[PDB]
């Protein structure tokens, strides 16, 4: 998380955490209540968030489910929903932790090798995470929308 | 050309070409007539083989030309036809060279980055070059099937 990031950055220079790092951790720990509440909100709408996220994705890129696509039947669409819930959980992990590194530790390192060995169009995965961001921001406060959109946007960028 | 590869290896070893290399270029030069025949046959029947393999690729992967795919739109399917033409011409160049260096350095090295930028499903192109392989084997002689299939297999494996 942000504490882990600060510790690693300080370890790189072989020094104690600077006052900037210390009061950044200060602000993060003080404001963690809002982050935990937003993680709770994202967790609660998990089934629906995945539901209309996948619906909008398929309406936007039906080729992934069309004849020739990676996920033709309800079985492979279910696998897409499974991966979709995976990356929703990853974004929740990032929100609670406050830093993107756990996402990198979980669902961003070697992802291109994953979705090349599987034939999945990674651009479609990015679009699905973008549908995450759009609908989730629709179902939450604007400032909280931006707070979650930071991690959704980072996942989108690592996609493309 | 295998002559360039052998010269490169000898220069790396700082030695004159070994008997294996000399025999390699000797067999290549003595058998250049068959490679030229393959090149002429591919050039003459390029337009039909590319169209047939593209049709078979469509039959395997209709989503590529579905409304929302990279090949959708007659412009965006003519561009697939042109890309298959380019790869067939590259294979023809390699057949008359004896090695895969021109294939590697004209359309293979950095192909993944280009097809990621354009969004093309590289595995679909692998299936397309496979279909080119079956079409060429059908139109071309049995003994030369091994020689042509070696290069097609190399292109498929590297670009898969």
């Amino acid at each position: 998380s942000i504490v882990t990031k600060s510790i690693v950055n300080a370890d790189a220079e072989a020094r104690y955490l600077s006052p900037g790092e210390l009061d950044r951790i200060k602000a993060f720990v003080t404001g963690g209540a809002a982050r935990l509440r937003i993680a709770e909100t994202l967790t609660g709408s998990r089934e629906t968030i995945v539901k209309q996220a996948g619906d909008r994705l398929f309406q936007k890129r039906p080729d992934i489910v069309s004849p020739g696509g990676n996920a033709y039947g309800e079985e492979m669409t279910a696998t897409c929903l499974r991966d979709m819930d995976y990356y929703l959980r990853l974004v929740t992990y990032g929100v609670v932790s406050g830093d993107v590194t756990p996402i990198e530790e979980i669902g961003l390192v070697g992802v291109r090798e994953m979705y090349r060995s599987l034939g999945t169009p990674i651009e479609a995965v990015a679009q699905s995470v973008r549908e995450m961001k759009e609908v989730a921001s629709g179902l939450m406060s604007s400032d909280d929308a931006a707070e979650a959109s930071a991690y959704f946007d980072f996942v989108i960028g690592k996609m493309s | 050309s295998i002559v360039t590869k052998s010269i490169v290896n000898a220069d790396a070893e700082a030695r004159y070409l070994s008997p294996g290399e000399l025999d390699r270029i000797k067999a290549f030069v003595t058998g250049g007539a068959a490679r030229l025949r393959i090149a002429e046959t591919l050039t003459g029947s390029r337009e039909t083989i590319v169209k047939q393999a593209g049709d078979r690729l469509f039959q395997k992967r209709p989503d590529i030309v579905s409304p929302g795919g990279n090949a959708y739109g007659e412009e965006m399917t003519a561009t697939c036809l042109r890309d298959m033409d380019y790869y067939l011409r590259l294979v023809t160049y390699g057949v008359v060279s004896g090695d895969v260096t021109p294939i590697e350095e004209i359309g293979l090295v950095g192909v993944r980055e280009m097809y990621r930028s354009l969004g093309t499903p590289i595995e679909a192109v692998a299936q397309s070059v496979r279909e080119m392989k079956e079409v060429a084997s059908g139109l071309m002689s049995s003994d030369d099937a091994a020689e042509a299939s070696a290069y097609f297999d190399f292109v498929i494996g590297k670009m898969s």
Binding site: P67, G68, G69, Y72, G73, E75, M76 | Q59, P62
Partner: peptide, 5 residues
């Protein structure tokens, strides 16, 4: 014309 699901 199909995909093995």
């Amino acid at each position: 014309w199909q995909n093995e699901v």
